[PDB]
Amino acid sequence: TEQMTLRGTLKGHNGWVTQIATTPQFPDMILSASRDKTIIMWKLTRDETNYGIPQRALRGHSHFVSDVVISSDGQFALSGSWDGTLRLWDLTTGTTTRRFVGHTKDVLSVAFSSDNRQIVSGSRDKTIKLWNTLGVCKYTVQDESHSEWVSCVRFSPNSSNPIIVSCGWDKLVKVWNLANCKLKTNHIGHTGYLNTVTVSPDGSLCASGGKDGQAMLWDLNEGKHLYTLDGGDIINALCFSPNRYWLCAATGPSIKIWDLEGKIIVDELKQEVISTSSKAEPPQCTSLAWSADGQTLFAGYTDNLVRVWQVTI
Amino acid sequence: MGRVRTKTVKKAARVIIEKYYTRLGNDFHTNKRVCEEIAIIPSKKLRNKIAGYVTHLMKRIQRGPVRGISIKLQEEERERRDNYVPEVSALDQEIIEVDPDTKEMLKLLDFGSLSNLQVTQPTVGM
Amino acid sequence: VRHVLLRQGVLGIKVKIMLPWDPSGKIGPKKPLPDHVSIVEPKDEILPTTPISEQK
Amino acid sequence: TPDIKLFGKWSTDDVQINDISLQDYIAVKEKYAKYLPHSAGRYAAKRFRKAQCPIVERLTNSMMMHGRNNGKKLMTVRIVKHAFEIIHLLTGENPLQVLVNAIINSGPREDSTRIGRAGTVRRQAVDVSPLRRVNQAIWLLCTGAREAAFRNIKTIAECLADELINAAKGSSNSYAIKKKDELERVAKSNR
Amino acid sequence: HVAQIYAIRQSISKALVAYYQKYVDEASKKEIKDILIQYDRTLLVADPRRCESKKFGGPGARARYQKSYR
RNA sequence: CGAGACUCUGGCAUGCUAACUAGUUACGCGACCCCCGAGCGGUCGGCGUCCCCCAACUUCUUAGAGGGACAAGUGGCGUUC
RNA sequence: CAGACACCAUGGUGCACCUGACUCCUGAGG
User: Fold this and answer.
1) What is the 3-state secondary structure (H, E, C) of chain A?
2) Is any atom of strand G within 7 angstroms of residue D115's beta carbon?
3) Pairing of β A235-240 and β A224-229
4) Which residues carry the post-translational modification N6-acetyllysine, per the record (chain A)?
């Protein structure tokens, strides 16, 4: 099995890089949300004095941008932010098309469909909302929509069927069928507040994990529990590979990357370092996203650098 | 110098840490929101001081239990860990040198052992 | 304050009552007390059940 | 302009510090070159802050003293710019180099601090910090220029120029030099 | 007059950078931010200092009337 | 109990919601039109008045709800408190 | 510990005060 070597490092953020997102059309784009109240669009010159140079800054919020997502073409950006709004920008220029107002409290998560017309958001006002690109709120899915905050909302590939999978701090995962907003299946069996959930790239499986550090593998086509894969430390972000069944989990002391077919541990990439204090000593990796083509793996770190690896045998 | 924490903050912090250990993070911003959910605090400055101290506590706590505070789950873990067995009790230690009067204590209990004799350089231990 | 007129002077009666309502009734004057904080209870983040899910 | 930031009609180049103990409180190009002095009009915000302020800016600030002249920086900047021109005619050179030399020669080495000794008038010989030596020098020179101007035809600009040149290479017609010799002499003596 | 001078300088440099940040390119705006921030003049960050309130019993804000003592 | 905490004011919100007893932007800008400069000139830029919209905005101006500071992040020190 | 160590006097008055029995009494009804 293969391994990851450090292709380069991306620079040039203030505050933690909370999210990263790629677009299919440009694997040379990387959109990144950071704690600086701005989302920065980078053009990757794939380089070794850097790894890119910032293309645009999409300016301004009153509080940190927690999550971001791009179009399938990567011409528009949808950001969710803790100033209680979501903003639709034109990624390649500026100018907000719309400001989506309908939350009175923090918007943790934003996600976008592959048809680019369903936009779903999760919030700490304990709602899952379905929105149009015109700022028109189609649905406000409450009731059986977590007892607690909505940490993340993800879109399953919609050309199978339009399904969203949400994770909440009530230690449950709820799978919804959109266009009727009713539960396909409630996944019960988790421990601890769920930080993240991720869909497989054909929507067949689902990997969910949180505080417990246990990534649990579910069949998202029947709503049944496959098995559990052991971590042992809080998982901040999960992401399946687009061209493989490799799950990468950003844990507290290390990014643990595993192969889910066959089952083995591909690598454990350290990020711990001599700087003993020792209660303020670790960074943890808060995000990771696989590239379009799955050659590259970008991870967003709380040390303000996105570290890129390219797979070598 | 100024604006050292008051009792009101610290009490609340102890409370929160014990009963919401798994929910709590280590990041100010998220903890600040958690304090809104799990309590009614009538000022933001007060809530910020509470939240703030609770992160500082969580950081210390996740190295095992620390001074003046303990969480129930960690107490159970230490209890189980300490099953420690340092003898089994006598080693056995039979038939070794003993003090000449400790010897007569064994002797008149139907045992006896080998025993030390003679006095050289008193005072003893000096 | 009330002035009670006496045949040798005036005496001052001052009555000051502190209401039993500040975080209740419903709620009383200017928020809960500024040095007091009330929690809920947890009773979550545990299960003995093994992971299983079923269609809804 | 970004290659070297000059003064507003003189150069910041060729300014040399002729002492090794007064370094890092004498500067004009060691980052601190300015066409026009002004930082933000606070200099008492940090104890760190004094290092930021170069000798030129400190000299403009110290000048505005005595009630009518207080809090008029614009008047002082005009007077100071004129003063530099007067120095340049009188000695050629660069006026800033003349200024630097004047500070070094006027700054004391040893001074005295009070110490008890029977209740009789005795004092302890002590060296003073280079920050203090620069601060005191700038004070002396400004006070000298103002003192002359007060009941004489010459303006503050002219008297300041005269005061710097006399101190730069000794003449014993500069107030700052005369005061320094008294402070160092007394220091050496004492108990 | 002075208040305005400082304000204008801050707005013009910020202006240039702002225009390049959304429309032209980041490298230009970033280059300008580098050059300014180093010698520094607070042209991209706000000054906190605004007038402090006057309190009674003095002729000034912190200045106070002369006392007299036997 | 006092003080702290607390409240009020000053500062940080090109985020949020608004404004014809408030303004700004932004055209189309024409006129008063001066050529001051560019352009042969129409036209473009221009202090103000005047053209005004089914224009756009809240930046300056206003006042409402919101967030930001908690020694938070990191590194030394301390009974590691 | 292990640097320096001085003169300086004088001055008047009163009231500090002592016992127990919960209603705004409700007052349409009561």
Assistant:
1) CCEEEEEEEECCCCCCCCEEECCCCCCCEEEEECCCCEEEEEECCCCCCCCCEEEEEEECCCCCEEEEEECCCCCEEEEEECCCCEEEEECCCEEEEEEECCCCCCCCEEEECCCCCCEEEECCCCCEEEECCCCCEEEEECCCCCCCCEEEEEECCCCCCCEEEEEECCCEEEEEECCCCEEEEEEECCCCCCCEEEECCCCCEEEEECCCCCEEEEECCCCEEEEEECCCCCEEEEEECCCCCEEEEEECCEEEEEEECCEEEEEEEECCCCCCCCCCCCCCEEEEEECCCCCEEEEEECCCCEEEEEEEC
2) yes
3) unpaired
4) 129, 182
For residues C13 and B5, give the distance between their C-alpha atoms in angstroms, rounded to a whole number.
Answer: 41
Tokens of D153: 């035809």
Contact E27 A57 (CB under 8 A): no
Whether a cis peptide bond, with omega within 30° of 0, leads into C38 is no
Half-sphere exposure of B111 (CA within 13 A, CB side): 14
Residue tagged 């709590």 (tokens): B24
Encoding tokens for residue A148?
């607690």
Give the integer Cα–Cα distance in Å for D30 and A112. 54
Minimum CA–CA partner of E30 in chain A = A54
What's the domain range around D44?
Answer: 1-191
Find the helix packing angle between D95-106 and D55-63, rounded to 10°: 80
Q: Which amino acid is at A124?
A: R
Contact A167, A210 (CB under 8 A): yes
Tokens coding A144: 């059986």
* A 76-135 → E contacts, CB under 8 A: 93-94
- Cα A250 to the center of its chain, rounded Å: 11
Q: Which of residues 52-91 of B touch strand F (CB under 7 A)?
A: 52-53, 55-56, 59-60, 66-68
| DSSP code of residue D127 | E
User: Is B62 in CB contact (< 8 Å) with chain A?
Assistant: yes
- Pull the structure tokens for residue C8: 């040798």
Nearest Cα to Cα of residue B24 among A192, A14, A150:
A192
Q: What is the resolution in angstroms?
A: 5.8
Q: Report the structure determination method.
A: cryo-EM
Residue A21 placed within a domain: yes
Q: Kind of pairing, strands A3-10 and A306-312?
A: antiparallel
Q: How far is CA B64 from each of CA B61, B67, D10, rounded to the nearest angstrom? A: 5, 10, 66
What b-and-e string marks burial along E33-69, b requiring 16 or more CB atoms within 10 Å of the CB? Answer: beebeeeebebeeeeeeeeeeeeeeeeeeeeeeeeee
Domain residues for the domain of A193 are: 7-313
Structural domain contains residue A43: yes
Structural domains counted in chain D: 1
Report whether A164 contacts A157 (CB < 8 A): no
Domain CATH for A143: 2.130.10.10
- Those residues whose C-beta lies under 8 Å from the C-beta of residue A6, and which sit 6 or more positions away, are A307, A308, A309
Q: Cβ separation of E39 and D2 shorter than 8 Å?
A: no
E31 lies within 8 A of chain A by CB: no
* Angstrom distances, CA of residue A87 to CA of A71, A77, A116, A131: 14, 8, 15, 12
Strand partners, A78: A69, A88
Residue with nearest Cα to nucleotide F4 C1' = B6
With both helix axes pointing from N to C terminus, report the angle between D55-63 and D130-149 in degrees, rounded to the nearest 10: 40
Length of chain C counted residue by residue: 56
- Count of structural domains, chain A: 1
Position A2 in a domain: no
Q: Is C53 helix (H, G, I), strand (E, B) or coil?
A: strand
CA dihedral E32, A55, A67, A288 (to 10 degrees): -110
> Residue D46 to residues D23, D42, D52, E60: CA-CA distances in angstroms?
20, 9, 10, 24
Residues in contact with C29: Cβ distance below 8 Å, sequence separation at least 6, in sequence order: C19, C21, C22
* Position A121 in a domain: yes
CB A153 within 8 A of CB A208: no
